[PDB]
Amino acid sequence: VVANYENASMAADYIKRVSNVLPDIGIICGSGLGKLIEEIEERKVIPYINIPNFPKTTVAGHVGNLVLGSVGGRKIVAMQGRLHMYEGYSNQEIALPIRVMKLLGVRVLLITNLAGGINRKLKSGDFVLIKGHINFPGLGLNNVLVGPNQDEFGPRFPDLSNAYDRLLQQLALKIAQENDFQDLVHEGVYAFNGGPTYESPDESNMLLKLGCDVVGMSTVPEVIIACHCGIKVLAVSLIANNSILDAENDVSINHEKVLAVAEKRADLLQMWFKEIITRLPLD
Amino acid sequence: VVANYENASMAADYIKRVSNVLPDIGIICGSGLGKLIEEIEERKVIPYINIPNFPKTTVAGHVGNLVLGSVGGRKIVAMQGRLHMYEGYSNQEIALPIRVMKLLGVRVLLITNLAGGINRKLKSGDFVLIKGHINFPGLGLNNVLVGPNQDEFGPRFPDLSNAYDRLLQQLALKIAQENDFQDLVHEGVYAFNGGPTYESPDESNMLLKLGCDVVGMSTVPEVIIACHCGIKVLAVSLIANNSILDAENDVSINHEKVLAVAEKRADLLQMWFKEIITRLPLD
Amino acid sequence: VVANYENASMAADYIKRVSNVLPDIGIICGSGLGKLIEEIEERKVIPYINIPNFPKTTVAGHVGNLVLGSVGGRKIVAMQGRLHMYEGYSNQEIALPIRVMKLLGVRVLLITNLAGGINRKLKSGDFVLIKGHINFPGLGLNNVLVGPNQDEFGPRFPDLSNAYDRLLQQLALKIAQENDFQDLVHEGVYAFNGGPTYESPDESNMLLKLGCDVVGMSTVPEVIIACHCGIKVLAVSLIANNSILDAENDVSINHEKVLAVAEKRADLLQMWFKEIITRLPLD
Ligand SMILES: Nc1ccnc(=O)[nH]1
Ligand SMILES: Nc1ccnc(=O)[nH]1
Ligand SMILES: Nc1ccnc(=O)[nH]1
């Protein structure tokens, strides 16, 4: 299924009928960081498998629902069960849900992820407001937009200079200051490693030399599809570990350790993003 | 359709019949830089769609013709409607037209493109004679030659040390000096970004650290196919903007601005390449 | 054919019946470095084409056999006819033979390759014990593990911090010292260039800036599949040429020159690896 105007429209038509929610904000949550979705009010849970033209996710298994409802007085749509490119999903499969969000009315997409810290200032449990990226798949002919352009959504050659909205980064930082956790909050450049192997020690050392502050396996594809169709983005990485320090100390990177950091910060991140949602401009 | 000897031969047989032109030189022109093709003498226009085994281009649409005729006393073949890998064309689809050029008798391929400037010396409207490249798709398992080798055209492992012919670069510079526009002409290393998103500000900053002088979304695949089958190459980038300066000044990159630079330099580039063609050696 | 548990089991069942050899060690040899396979004792040669679910290799042609037998008192299985990703083999085709090795009982995989030297200390004919890697395909969404995870073999997100076993590197160096060829032996980081074009002069210069010591077109995919399923790895590069020096001197890289270096060091490498095999721990 191509992520075109007709196919995205058919999915949005189904969702509009079944949900009766017109969302202004979209959310995609990192692993272990999805509990805000469980707290959506007046919520409507729509399995991906029920939505016309949504990507098939049964090979990977696990949860796959679109959840619509109200958070902090705003109407939102959430992806419960993120699609990651290391699973083998195509460019079309990644793009269609974001384009459906656009047709549903989403103007702002909020994204969280778990990432490795490269910059020396970053400790496990820190947050990084993403201000730019290095898209290794994109440089390497695996950009999420490779393929025919879908003109109804955006231009053939998008500029990414404003992919990460500055005002949204400023609002996120302001809320952290108001709640006295700004000492945890940094800003930085995200390197997209296609994955699914963690960054090797020597890849981490290369990323250090190349300016990269954090590395992870997601986010950049969704950012690009959103930017292409005019959706503003705030993307926040939770630092699971400092990969440069771990390489210096012969310490392994491990998904169980990553998820334990997610559990440690999950409630703070939920509170933060709920307040961001309530504070977003009405326009 | 595989870009093999039999299939390329079938395309060349059709072209030889319909055109009656045996070209010595091939040309592939950047966007907005194609007007020389409109000035080919005694010309024969062959739609790609009519040529056996040529790639289907109707999804992208727009023009797709092979144009044969005379420029500056030399017999040439031009691609009117370049095939770009960000459109989703396969390695086989990119390679077949160049291999057809080889079977038609092409010994020299002239290429122009529009690119972003990384080196600080580069201003909008400058020309860069490409002297080498950094092929991010190639490093990343998306080299245009991935797949079975077609032994009749070239070796399994081509060396790229002489992919950009030195004598052709020297001739291009000499003609610029004779016409007093050598102040516009630089030389440099081309980074291939698969695209189609423009280089992000942080990707540009990385390319600066990595020695790259210019960045763009084309050219390297054609250079490699030509080098593989023994065709000499001259490749010239027209600098649309300096991406490092634009990132420092929060200035966007935009295809309309790119095309306006192409329009500003199109006539000078046509005159330059016409003279290069007339001055090429007969052997 | 997916490189899953059922399919790998069917291949291993066939091999166990026909060979009567239960191997503890696997070997994959670089081009021109395969003569140890010819010296396997009590050997059983099994054409890939006869093994259920093994990848089809007839388009590339050339030899394709699994060879089982005894070397230095240990039971081994060798791939005679390596599968390279620049040929177009899929992730599944690369992974299945290594996973078959795992089901056959392989605990240690020994790998050799031919590579370009980047580090200035490296001369043609030197050996590099690989201690880490920079996986450009992996960063670029072409990691050998992209696709559904096969849980029976390993985790979704492997850590590569111990992909190159330290004790095996130490044993290899110790044997070189005992035989007075330690002056040829270095250690270093391997950059994976998908290929099949040799590293361009400017790619080599970039790799120098990025810490890389050697560059080649293989090995990293097999290392990752082995690491994913718990097989320890020793990987050794034979330096065919110093690409930085060759770029400084306008000297070409050439497969015939590469193979001549392989021939010059083939007998020493066979003796070295035979002794490594005899000296490997029984556990
Ligand atoms: N160290 C890491 C943590 C989480 N995700 C990554 O890709 N890397
Ligand atoms: N800045 C740029 C201009 C043209 N092409 C590119 O890829 N980048
Ligand atoms: N210079 C090289 C020799 C062998 N293999 C490579 O990839 N490069």
Side-chain angles (χ1 to χ4, degrees), chain A residues 1-34 36-37 39-283, chain B residues 1-34 36-37 39-283, chain C residues 1-34 36-37 39-283:
Chain A
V1 162
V2 180
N4 64 18
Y5 184 52
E6 170 182 18
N7 291 340
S9 292
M10 184 174 187
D13 284 347
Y14 177 85
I15 294 155
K16 283 189 281 191
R17 282 169 32 214
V18 180
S19 78
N20 202 37
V21 170
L22 290 180
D24 297 327
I25 296 154
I27 69 176
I28 297 172
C29 302
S31 49
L33 308 178
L36 181 60
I37 302 175
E39 298 298 328
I40 295 170
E41 306 186 69
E42 302 160 311
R43 69 175 204 158
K44 178 61 194 181
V45 182
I46 308 179
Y48 294 162
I49 197 171
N50 294 340
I51 305 171
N53 303 318
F54 252 57
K56 180 171 182 61
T57 68
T58 59
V59 175
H62 305 273
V63 68
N65 294 316
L66 217 60
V67 184
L68 295 96
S70 291
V71 171
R74 305 299 311 272
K75 299 171 184 176
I76 75 108
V77 52
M79 295 190 73
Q80 189 178 52
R82 187 175 198 163
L83 308 174
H84 289 99
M85 300 205 67
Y86 55 70
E87 289 290 335
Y89 293 117
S90 74
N91 286 355
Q92 306 309 319
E93 288 172 310
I94 300 299
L96 183 136
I98 305 305
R99 290 177 173 165
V100 170
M101 287 186 180
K102 176 74 191 297
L103 297 186
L104 292 171
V106 166
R107 291 188 296 271
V108 173
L109 175 57
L110 306 179
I111 307 175
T112 60
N113 64 59
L114 268 297
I118 302 293
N119 191 298
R120 226 71 349 88
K121 295 176 175 183
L122 297 176
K123 297 184 194 61
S124 182
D126 286 349
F127 301 111
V128 178
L129 308 177
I130 297 169
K131 63 180 171 70
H133 67 230
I134 299 180
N135 181 7
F136 289 100
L139 296 175
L141 262 175
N142 279 333
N143 195 293
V144 71
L145 283 171
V146 168
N149 190 58
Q150 304 304 333
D151 297 323
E152 296 90 344
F153 292 102
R156 169 77 285 187
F157 306 108
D159 168 78
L160 302 177
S161 300
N162 304 130
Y164 302 94
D165 188 86
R166 270 118 165 251
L167 289 181
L168 294 182
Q169 293 174 54
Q170 294 172 14
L171 174 58
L173 179 63
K174 180 100 77 183
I175 291 165
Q177 298 167 342
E178 292 167 351
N179 293 276
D180 192 38
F181 69 95
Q182 73 289 331
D183 64 291
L184 302 180
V185 182
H186 303 251
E187 64 178 33
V189 172
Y190 181 99
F192 179 23
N193 167 29
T197 55
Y198 286 116
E199 61 272 18
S200 76
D202 297 292
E203 290 159 3
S204 295
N205 257 97
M206 177 184 70
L207 296 180
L208 176 48
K209 295 170 183 161
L210 296 184
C212 302
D213 300 296
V214 310
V215 60
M217 307 175 191
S218 70
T219 298
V220 168
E222 292 98 319
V223 171
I224 288 172
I225 298 305
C227 180
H228 177 261
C229 71
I231 292 175
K232 296 183 182 65
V233 174
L234 172 68
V236 177
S237 287
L238 172 60
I239 303 304
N241 67 294
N242 189 293
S243 302
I244 290 296
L245 208 49
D246 293 341
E248 287 170 343
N249 290 305
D250 293 320
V251 168
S252 64
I253 308 176
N254 172 270
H255 190 60
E256 298 85 86
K257 291 199 282 183
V258 170
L259 288 180
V261 178
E263 187 45 44
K264 176 183 170 177
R265 290 290 190 235
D267 293 282
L268 180 60
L269 184 62
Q270 180 206 12
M271 190 284 310
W272 191 13
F273 269 54
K274 182 178 176 181
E275 182 70 6
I276 291 167
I277 292 169
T278 78
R279 297 269 292 274
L280 285 178
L282 299 174
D283 289 22
Chain B
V1 162
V2 180
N4 64 18
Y5 184 52
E6 170 182 18
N7 291 340
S9 292
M10 184 174 187
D13 284 347
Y14 177 85
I15 294 155
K16 283 189 281 191
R17 282 169 32 214
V18 180
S19 78
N20 202 37
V21 170
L22 290 180
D24 297 327
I25 296 154
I27 69 176
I28 297 172
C29 302
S31 49
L33 308 178
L36 181 60
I37 302 175
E39 298 298 328
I40 295 170
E41 306 186 69
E42 302 160 311
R43 69 175 204 158
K44 178 61 194 181
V45 182
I46 308 179
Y48 294 162
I49 197 171
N50 294 340
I51 305 171
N53 303 318
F54 252 57
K56 180 171 182 61
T57 68
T58 59
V59 175
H62 305 273
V63 68
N65 294 316
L66 217 60
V67 184
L68 295 96
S70 291
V71 171
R74 305 299 311 272
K75 299 171 184 176
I76 75 108
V77 52
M79 295 190 73
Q80 189 178 52
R82 187 175 198 163
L83 308 174
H84 289 99
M85 300 205 67
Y86 55 70
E87 289 290 335
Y89 293 117
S90 74
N91 286 355
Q92 306 309 319
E93 288 172 310
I94 300 299
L96 183 136
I98 305 305
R99 290 177 173 165
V100 170
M101 287 186 180
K102 176 74 191 297
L103 297 186
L104 292 171
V106 166
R107 291 188 296 271
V108 173
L109 175 57
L110 306 179
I111 307 175
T112 60
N113 64 59
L114 268 297
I118 302 293
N119 191 298
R120 226 71 349 88
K121 295 176 175 183
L122 297 176
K123 297 184 194 61
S124 182
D126 286 349
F127 301 111
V128 178
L129 308 177
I130 297 169
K131 63 180 171 70
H133 67 230
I134 299 180
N135 181 7
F136 289 100
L139 296 175
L141 262 175
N142 279 333
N143 195 293
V144 71
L145 283 171
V146 168
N149 190 58
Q150 304 304 333
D151 297 323
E152 296 90 344
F153 292 102
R156 169 77 285 187
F157 306 108
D159 168 78
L160 302 177
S161 300
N162 304 130
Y164 302 94
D165 188 86
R166 270 118 165 251
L167 289 181
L168 294 182
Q169 293 174 54
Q170 294 172 14
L171 174 58
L173 179 63
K174 180 100 77 183
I175 291 165
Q177 298 167 342
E178 292 167 351
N179 293 276
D180 192 38
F181 69 95
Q182 73 289 331
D183 64 291
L184 302 180
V185 182
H186 303 251
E187 64 178 33
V189 172
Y190 181 99
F192 179 23
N193 167 29
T197 55
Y198 286 116
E199 61 272 18
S200 76
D202 297 292
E203 290 159 3
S204 295
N205 257 97
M206 177 184 70
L207 296 180
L208 176 48
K209 295 170 183 161
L210 296 184
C212 302
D213 300 296
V214 310
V215 60
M217 307 175 191
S218 70
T219 298
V220 168
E222 292 98 319
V223 171
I224 288 172
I225 298 305
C227 180
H228 177 261
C229 71
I231 292 175
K232 296 183 182 65
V233 174
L234 172 68
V236 177
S237 287
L238 172 60
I239 303 304
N241 67 294
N242 189 293
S243 302
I244 290 296
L245 208 49
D246 293 341
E248 287 170 343
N249 290 305
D250 293 320
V251 168
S252 64
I253 308 176
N254 172 270
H255 190 60
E256 298 85 86
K257 291 199 282 183
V258 170
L259 288 180
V261 178
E263 187 45 44
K264 176 183 170 177
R265 290 290 190 235
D267 293 282
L268 180 60
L269 184 62
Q270 180 206 12
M271 190 284 310
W272 191 13
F273 269 54
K274 182 178 176 181
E275 182 70 6
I276 291 167
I277 292 169
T278 78
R279 297 269 292 274
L280 285 178
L282 299 174
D283 289 22
Chain C
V1 162
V2 180
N4 64 18
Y5 184 52
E6 170 182 18
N7 291 340
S9 292
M10 184 174 187
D13 284 347
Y14 177 85
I15 294 155
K16 283 189 281 191
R17 282 169 32 214
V18 180
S19 78
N20 202 37
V21 170
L22 290 180
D24 297 327
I25 296 154
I27 69 176
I28 297 172
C29 302
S31 49
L33 308 178
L36 181 60
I37 302 175
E39 298 298 328
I40 295 170
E41 306 186 69
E42 302 160 311
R43 69 175 204 158
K44 178 61 194 181
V45 182
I46 308 179
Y48 294 162
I49 197 171
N50 294 340
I51 305 171
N53 303 318
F54 252 57
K56 180 171 182 61
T57 68
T58 59
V59 175
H62 305 273
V63 68
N65 294 316
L66 217 60
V67 184
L68 295 96
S70 291
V71 171
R74 305 299 311 272
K75 299 171 184 176
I76 75 108
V77 52
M79 295 190 73
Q80 189 178 52
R82 187 175 198 163
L83 308 174
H84 289 99
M85 300 205 67
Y86 55 70
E87 289 290 335
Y89 293 117
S90 74
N91 286 355
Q92 306 309 319
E93 288 172 310
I94 300 299
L96 183 136
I98 305 305
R99 290 177 173 165
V100 170
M101 287 186 180
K102 176 74 191 297
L103 297 186
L104 292 171
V106 166
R107 291 188 296 271
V108 173
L109 175 57
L110 306 179
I111 307 175
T112 60
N113 64 59
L114 268 297
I118 302 293
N119 191 298
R120 226 71 349 88
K121 295 176 175 183
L122 297 176
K123 297 184 194 61
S124 182
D126 286 349
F127 301 111
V128 178
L129 308 177
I130 297 169
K131 63 180 171 70
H133 67 230
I134 299 180
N135 181 7
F136 289 100
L139 296 175
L141 262 175
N142 279 333
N143 195 293
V144 71
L145 283 171
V146 168
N149 190 58
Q150 304 304 333
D151 297 323
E152 296 90 344
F153 292 102
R156 169 77 285 187
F157 306 108
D159 168 78
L160 302 177
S161 300
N162 304 130
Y164 302 94
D165 188 86
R166 270 118 165 251
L167 289 181
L168 294 182
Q169 293 174 54
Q170 294 172 14
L171 174 58
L173 179 63
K174 180 100 77 183
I175 291 165
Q177 298 167 342
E178 292 167 351
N179 293 276
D180 192 38
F181 69 95
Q182 73 289 331
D183 64 291
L184 302 180
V185 182
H186 303 251
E187 64 178 33
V189 172
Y190 181 99
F192 179 23
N193 167 29
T197 55
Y198 286 116
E199 61 272 18
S200 76
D202 297 292
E203 290 159 3
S204 295
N205 257 97
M206 177 184 70
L207 296 180
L208 176 48
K209 295 170 183 161
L210 296 184
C212 302
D213 300 296
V214 310
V215 60
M217 307 175 191
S218 70
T219 298
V220 168
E222 292 98 319
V223 171
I224 288 172
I225 298 305
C227 180
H228 177 261
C229 71
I231 292 175
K232 296 183 182 65
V233 174
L234 172 68
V236 177
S237 287
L238 172 60
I239 303 304
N241 67 294
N242 189 293
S243 302
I244 290 296
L245 208 49
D246 293 341
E248 287 170 343
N249 290 305
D250 293 320
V251 168
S252 64
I253 308 176
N254 172 270
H255 190 60
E256 298 85 86
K257 291 199 282 183
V258 170
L259 288 180
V261 178
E263 187 45 44
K264 176 183 170 177
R265 290 290 190 235
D267 293 282
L268 180 60
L269 184 62
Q270 180 206 12
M271 190 284 310
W272 191 13
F273 269 54
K274 182 178 176 181
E275 182 70 6
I276 291 167
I277 292 169
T278 78
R279 297 269 292 274
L280 285 178
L282 299 174
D283 289 22

